[PDB]
Recover the amino acids of this structure.
């Protein structure tokens, strides 16, 4: 289990990021149970958004795989909870770490860009009706994100 | 006042700033410290992506706050 | 399958493996492997990486993973003597802890094994 | 006759003049001027000197004063970003001690003068 | 045993040696540490200039001793 | 008084060199009152050899000037107490410091090279009669170096 992985993992558990809980998994360590906070001033406010994050066996030459588990009404997330973020694909570097990926996903909840691949008729709703998209997102946050 | 900027690894650093410093000002101060240019820098605070035109005043980033640094991003 | 220089086990294609009892400065940590630099290569770009870490990256990519600048491995050079010293004098502890119990400077470890190590004498 | 960057007095043809309250590492001390490096130039030789210190030496000599290797100033380059950082974050104290009483990182001093210095505001 | 070698600036460096190590052996160990080749190294001890062929044994340079280093020399 | 000079001066008074006492002078600081010990196994054994050492105003681009004050029977020293040592002339570098110069002069008492320009009929005595040169040196050491 490459030493880098281990060092990153400990510099998360020791040095947390606020509103971002990330522990490793017991079954297999290359695999993290992430939980991101619905950010300030976003329609996702006060939501418990659970994520699964996984390190492929070419980490860090290749980027991590990250997927939402909690359903959320957002252009750059899809049906099965995968995300469109360039630091997870187009512009990744071993410079970046787990924590950077997790901070940029948090940033994405505060800046939902309707320029997705087609982001459903959800990005189409965001670009043609921001009012009711903010609303719906606030509903999926309440009705799927409040662990309560 | 002074703020903190958590950089790539975790080695936290401090910046001498005052409330009306723009985020463009702060991203040249992190270029002095970490040798990263302001064009491949994005600053996160409370989950919100801090915009380049706006000030530290515009997000209430007061004394003792900790900004976070990531190496360029684009969602979508 | 145990290594001559560092007393750990690793393949001929992996970096050496030390155990720093004191906190290493982050500016001396290679960005690729989050460890203290070994055989540091400065890039033309101006950054610094472990020799094998950068060479491997450049097997199938071609940029300074730090500012996406195009980077031919050929153009990189060994770092300043200053850099090398700062690294060489970093404290490591003996790999063979349940035998020998010695703190010492990284550079000296290889020789510490041949002169005054009951662990490396015993091998394991 | 007082300097904009460092708050001391020196001519344009002299290095800047700082006051380090903490002990600087010897590997960061330029061999020519026994001070912490400023604007460090790595030589091809592999050594490191302050820009002005080396350029002046090479006005009238032509070798790395360390191993007598022939040294054209032209061939030298600025040091790794690593080096520069290690230096930039060294603590200095404010030159204007009898107005302002501030410790801070070397690189930030120039700006500390324009933002929050009663001494540099008053000038002297 | 171990000896000390005071290098150019004032710094002391320790060397892992044993009594029959030649001064030629010691001058490759200071090349490992300070990056100075053995041909532009002269070692002083108790005022005596330590010769390259002879051993640490030959000048009684025992445990805890401090050799001094100068960058090549020639008298006359 | 160039900062280098100051730093060297303190890294002498703090970090002395054994059998080599070197203080700066009060009248003018560019000027040191040095005292070297007659080394082990040399004919100068147990002599108090006083030196004057001076930094020219182009230090360290130019080397220091060094002169024995105590009279001593040695090829590489002369009538007025000046010394033939290359690190003080031919092969000097700002790499070197006061301490290095002082250690090499000590080394020279333990390695008197009769190859001088001439070194009197003293180098001529050293090369044609080492026995009686050792003797005479031992005499100038006793009869001019024992502060008494
Ligand atoms: Zn190894
Ligand atoms: Zn590495
Ligand atoms: Zn051991
Ligand atoms: Zn200045
Ligand atoms: Zn200098
Ligand atoms: Zn001030």
């Amino acid at each position: 289990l490459p030493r880098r992985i281990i060092k990153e993992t400990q510099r998360l558990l020791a040095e947390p990021v606020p509103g971002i809980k990330a522990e490793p998994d017991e079954s297999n360590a290359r695999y993290f149970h992430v939980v991101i906070a619905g950010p300030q001033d976003s329609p996702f406010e006060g939501g418990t958004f659970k994520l699964e994050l996984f390190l492929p066996e070419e980490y860090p030459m290749a980027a991590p795989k990250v997927r939402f588990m909690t359903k959320i009404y957002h252009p750059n997330v899809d049906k099965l909870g995968r995300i469109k973020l360039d630091i997870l694909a187009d512009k990744w570097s071993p410079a970046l770490q787990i924590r950077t990926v997790l901070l940029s996903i948090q940033a994405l909840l505060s800046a939902p860009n309707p320029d997705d691949p087609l982001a459903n008729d959800v990005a189409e709703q965001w670009k043609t009706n921001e009012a009711q998209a903010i609303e719906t997102a606030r509903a999926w946050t309440r009705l799927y994100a409040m662990n309560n | 006042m002074q703020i903190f900027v958590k950089t790539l690894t975790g080695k936290t650093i401090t910046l001498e700033v005052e409330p009306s410093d723009t985020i463009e000002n702060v991203k040249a101060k992190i270029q002095d410290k970490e040798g990263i240019p302001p064009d491949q820098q994005r600053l996160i605070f409370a989950g919100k992506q801090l915009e380049d035109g706006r000030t530290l005043s515009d997000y209430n980033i007061q004394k003792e706050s900790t900004l976070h640094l990531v190496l360029r991003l684009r969602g979508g | 399958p145990l290594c001559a220089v560092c007393g750990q086990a690793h393949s001929l294609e992996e970096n050496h493996f030390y155990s720093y009892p004191e906190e290493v400065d982050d500016d001396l940590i290679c960005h690729i492997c989050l460890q203290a630099l070994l055989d540091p290569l400065d890039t033309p770009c101006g950054h610094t990486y472990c020799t094998l870490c950068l060479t491997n990256f450049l097997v199938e990519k071609d940029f300074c993973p730090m500012d996406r600048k195009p980077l031919v491995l050929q153009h990189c050079k060994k770092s300043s003597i200053l850099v090398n010293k700062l690294l060489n004098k970093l404290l490591v502890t003996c790999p063979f802890r349940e035998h020998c119990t010695q703190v010492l400077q990284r550079c000296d470890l290889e020789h510490h094994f041949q002169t005054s190590c009951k662990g490396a004498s015993h091998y394991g």
User: Anything to note?
Assistant: The pocket of zinc ion (ligand 3) is lined by residues C 94, 96, 100, 102, 112, 117, 119-120 (CB under 6 Å). Chain E touches chain C through seven residues (CB under 8 Å). The two ends of chain E are 36 Å apart (CA to CA). The beta strands of chain E are 2-6, 12-16, 42-45, 48-49, 66-70.
